[PDB]
């Protein structure tokens, strides 16, 4: 559930 709205937007399953 960890989402980083950055470039690139990387999201993690947690």
Distance CA 7, CA 14 (A): 19
Strand segments (E) across 1-14? 2-4, 10-12
Counting Cα atoms < 13 Å in the Cβ hemisphere of 2 gives 2
Q: Name the nearest CA neighbour of 14 among 2, 4, 5.
A: 2
């Amino acid at each position: 559930g960890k989402a980083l709205f950055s470039n690139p937007p990387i999201a993690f399953p947690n």
